[PDB]
Design an enzyme around this catalytic site. Structure first.
Site, PDB file in Angstrom:
ATOM      1  CG  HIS A  41      -0.583   0.145   2.515  1.00 28.62           C
ATOM      2  ND1 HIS A  41      -0.125   1.349   3.033  1.00 28.62           N
ATOM      3  CD2 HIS A  41      -0.620  -0.768   3.513  1.00 28.62           C
ATOM      4  CE1 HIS A  41       0.154   1.115   4.308  1.00 28.62           C
ATOM      5  NE2 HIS A  41      -0.120  -0.146   4.643  1.00 28.62           N
ATOM      6  N   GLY A 135       2.417   5.923  10.357  1.00 31.02           N
ATOM      7  CA  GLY A 135       3.852   5.854  10.086  1.00 31.02           C
ATOM      8  C   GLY A 135       4.486   4.548  10.558  1.00 31.02           C
ATOM      9  CB  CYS A 137       2.491   0.799   7.517  1.00 29.51           C
ATOM     10  SG  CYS A 137       0.798   1.251   7.987  1.00 29.51           S
TER      11      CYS A 137
END
Ligand SMILES: O=C1N(c2cncc3ccc(F)cc23)CC[C@]12COc1ccc(Cl)cc12
Ligand SMILES: O=C1N(c2cncc3ccc(F)cc23)CC[C@]12COc1ccc(Cl)cc12
Ligand SMILES: [Cl-]
Lengths: 297, 302
Positions: A41, A135, A137
């Site tokens: 993503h 932030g 991920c």
């Protein structure tokens, strides 16, 4: 003495954390050999979005050094960025998929920089009760066996109840989740029975015996009680796995089950077990043996 | 979202752990630059521990009596000196993995990460607080002596604790990195006991503000309290007194949530009186006191 929620030493994983930027999105990547792994993503029709990207669109930063991306490919929900430099700090590692109830350490990261480490468990509903902000991920979950890091989780998203969802390092989600903004929710969760029993054995080893009783039960009768209190069923495999702790403390697994049944039906009556007023289910039988024996890495 | 007991990443400390052996005793040492720091009781036998004269035991040792192992490499000891309850072993190699570091002495209520070690090898990392009675509720077995506590705000490691002993109640006692013990403890096997422990009030308030930030307000009430009335009630539940310093320190969390410190104090008073009535706060059925105001700001969303 003492019993803490303990994580594995994180140094071998810290040396693999990098920052990945694509457009306006910045998240974390895992740099192993010459490949950086991160959630897809960071770039929905992911094949269509990916084909429009060039290697130089992915900015990868390892400390104060910019790595150059020389290739890219997608595997399930993970993006694999081929870089020109192999990570000289790459440890001995494996990618492993874990089962619900298994525990692991999470190295929470922001902008490719590690901020904290905590221990958690894959819930029976495939979510994790983590601690993550925007932030985070690309932060990873792992275990260590001897000198080998087994990477088992990569963070992808937060669900509306504040719990977290992610994939293994091959990009397969844990749970019926998808990587997109759509209506998704964690299913009804249950308690990890084998882990509660392991923690009761840890309490006995540390000197707490108030919950022990003279009674025993059968696996069938205990499972009828476990079903009533939203506890996962206990299998003969779980009973076998708890064998060593049963032999060390002198309390048979079905004898500890009778203690657990009594705790479920009557509560703790103002008492605590290992400093807790709730039954703890995020320690496996192996975690209990490891912490009560001091295994090193 | 979420709130976990979070430790600092341990890698910077892992690269400093070594094994120190003197005679039959083996424990952990901290190798920074060309010095290995370890508990001075490494020079004692179990018999020596009742009334050891460390100066007399140390004068009988030479540099080659101390075996220091860093991984699979034996370091050479070229000097030794004692500073309070810590032994400083000068070695002939500076640790190339030495991080940016400082030695800091902490106050009760402060939290830190512990890298538990055995034979110079790290086994796990967990989060601790220095209790008001100067002990720590750690998880340590025999061979864990010399394991260290630290914080890593920025890129600098602040070493604040070195493990020395376990008290009869299962709690732990140790020193700062200058070898000064926290509390009234001595590195002797004489009858010693932890004093009555109390709850770290400022930390419980910080954790209640963390719960509000994460969306939980069930425990709030329409009341306020004076600081003195709060302390009179709180002392009855073995809670530490709350000072004006603590009230000032909670200012930022108060401004962020819109709940005055004394209004949060009133909610704490009610929780002590009523219990939780089957409810939880941040996944806990007990009031948590091992998160400081600084830890809450660091972990929680702004
Ligand atoms: O959940 C998400 N994110 C968060 C992750 N971990 C803690 C987060 C905490 C807060 C927060 F606002 C976002 C967080 C950031 C990206 C995002 C937002 O929408 C998404 C849709 C699909 C996917 Cl795969 C991922 C995301
Ligand atoms: O408490 C102690 N030790 C332990 C430390 N940490 C957890 C331990 C856990 C178990 C155990 F048996 C010993 C442990 C090892 C040495 C010892 C034994 O008596 C002492 C007296 C004074 C001093 Cl400074 C040190 C010690
Ligand atoms: Cl302090």
């Amino acid at each position: 003495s003492g019993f803490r929620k303990m994580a594995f030493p994180s140094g071998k994983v810290e040396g693999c954390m990098v920052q990945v930027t694509c457009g306006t999105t910045t998240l974390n990547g895992l740099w192993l050999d010459d490949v950086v792994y991160c959630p897809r993503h960071v770039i929905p029709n992911y094949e269509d979005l990916l084909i429009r990207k060039s290697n130089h669109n992915f900015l990868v930063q390892a400390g104060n050094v910019q790595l150059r991306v020389i290739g890219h490919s997608m595997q399930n929900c993970v993006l694999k960025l081929k870089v020109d430099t192999a990570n000289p700090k790459t440890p001995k590692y494996k990618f492993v998929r874990i089962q619900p109830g298994q525990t692991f350490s999470v190295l929470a990261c922001y902008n490719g920089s590690p901020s904290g480490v905590y221990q958690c468990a894959m819930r029976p509903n495939f979510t994790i009760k983590g601690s993550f902000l925007n932030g985070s991920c690309g932060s990873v979950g792992f275990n260590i066996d001897y000198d080998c890091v087994s990477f088992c989780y990569m963070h992808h998203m937060e669900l509306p109840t504040g719990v977290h969802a992610g994939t293994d390092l091959e990009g397969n989600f844990y749970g019926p989740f998808v990587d997109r903004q759509t209506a998704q929710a964690a299913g009804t969760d249950t308690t990890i029975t084998v882990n509660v029993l392991a923690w009761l054995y840890a309490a006995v080893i540390n000197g707490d015996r108030w919950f022990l009783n003279r009674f025993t039960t059968t696996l069938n009768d205990f499972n009828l009680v476990a079903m009533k209190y939203n506890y996962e069923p206990l299998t003969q495999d779980h009973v076998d796995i708890l064998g060593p702790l049963s032999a060390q403390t002198g309390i048979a697994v079905l004898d500890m089950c009778a203690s657990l049944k009594e705790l479920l039906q009557n509560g703790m009556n103002g008492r605590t077990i290992l400093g807790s007023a709730l039954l703890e289910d995020e320690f496996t039988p192996f975690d209990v043996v490891r912490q009560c024996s001091g295994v090193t890495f």
